[PDB]
């Protein structure tokens, strides 16, 4: 099934944070309404925060995470969890290889902020 | 119910990252086997990362997050989610005041790394 | 934090299903817009499905789960998970005693249906 | 990503319950250590319970859920959620058609019991 695609409340600020855990350079692209809004790149096998940014969900609320390693798309997993009916996390894992740890790039989206 | 307490696989490296969304300084303590292993503090109303670190779960695997603001422990909410039976997230939200947004300090624990 | 309260899409059918795992008779009450819409009850230490029902979330979409044992309110834990941005589960555990297994009555809410 | 595969604690009872929301008969197979341990069949567009059972996770703790409709394997989505470090839910959705509602057979696994 489609993964790494979330519908947020419209015109709402959210945080997006990417972590790396692989030998190869991870490229994370965050798209809002089908247009790239942040990009982070880096290599780490120690969960380096390769980028964090505050974005606005815009008119559509559509947020999509894509991950690649030197041009090759990684396979994604994702889900959303809501705590106390108020606190939202959208979670992405990605796999660039064969070991299926799905941690090669890890992306966490959180809202609301402030 | 108890919140902010997670059993990790023993002797496993994990990532812990905290964000702030509140007027007051957040202090985040991360305990491993009931001893403080990391402490983060900072202030942001824009989801700033107030700390990130890699720790080991130790012999017991017992990890606990506690949050203090303005001299008092915040009310916690938490859950653990596992994606594709491989990728683990331990998620914590906290409330230091009256509005119940639960985002005042947000803590993300992830494993495995590497 | 408040637990057992979920905001569902307005005017939308959902399934609610309750399981029992305790020596005492569980009573599960499902409130829609602050009014009892369903009540399930039974006694099992083997996950008996003490009730299942389809309800409509109504104009507000507010849904609350309350559990009691021998006329005493059980402590609740809850969260909502969303799969592939489309499939929703609202999850409730409850504790009636001292062992903190939180499985004494378990309630699963699922939408959409059809 | 592989979906509908869960590692449970070894030799532990768990509940498995399946619901149907589709025009076609859903067949749900539950495998423990790669051997079929339960099979549920049924048809409903109203979230009817097509089966419920308690099974033992065995020496491996490997549990896999498979869903088919008239012999055709359904695409799965899944996750595991743990509340208060105690109560576990393994959640599965499936899609047999083109509408991607992923509720055609919904499977809920829960543990511990008792
Ligand atoms: C070559 O494999 C890549 O790098 C390794 C060090 C591991 O992080 C593995 O998960 C990843 O897919
Ligand atoms: C008396 O304690 C109650 O019954 C027992 C059989 C257990 O299921 C326990 O979790 C429950 O709280
Ligand atoms: C033919 O399509 C199947 O039956 C319909 C009644 C819907 O439940 C749909 O989601 C399902 O895939
Ligand atoms: C700016 C405000 O600061 C504190 O009062 C928080 O509890 C609120 O949620 C908000 O972040
Ligand atoms: Ca990998
Ligand atoms: Ca890796
Ligand atoms: Ca607050
Ligand atoms: Ca706040
Ligand atoms: Ca109990
Ligand atoms: Ca019990
Ligand atoms: Ca369908
Ligand atoms: Ca359907």
Automatic annotation (TrEMBL), chains A, B, C, D:
Ca(2+) 3 binds at residue 114. Ca(2+) 2 binds at residues 95-96, 99, 101, 104. SUPFAM superfamilies: Calcium-mediated lectin. Keywords: Calcium, Metal-binding. GO terms for biological process: single-species biofilm formation. InterPro entries: Ca-mediated_lectin, Ca_lectin_sf, Lectin_sugar-bd. Residues 6-113 form the Calcium-mediated lectin domain. Gene3D superfamilies: Calcium-mediated lectin. It comes from the Bacteria. One of its GO terms (molecular function) is carbohydrate binding. Ca(2+) 1 binds at residues 21, 99, 101, 103-104, 114. The keyword Metal-binding applies. This is Fucose-binding lectin PA-IIL.
């Amino acid at each position: 099934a489609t993964q790494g695609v979330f519908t947020l409340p419209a015109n709402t600020r959210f945080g997006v944070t990417a972590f790396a855990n692989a030998s190869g350079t991870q490229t994370v692209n965050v798209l809002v309404n089908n247009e790239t809004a942040a990009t982070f790149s880096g290599q780490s096998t120690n969960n380096a925060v390769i980028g964090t940014q505050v974005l606005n969900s815009g008119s559509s609320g559509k947020v999509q995470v894509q991950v690649s390693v030197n041009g090759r798309p990684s396979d994604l997993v994702s889900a959303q969890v809501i705590l106390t009916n108020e606190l939202n996390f959208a979670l992405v894992g990605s796999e660039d290889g064969t070991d299926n740890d799905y941690n090669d790039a890890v992306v966490v989206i959180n809202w609301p902020l402030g």
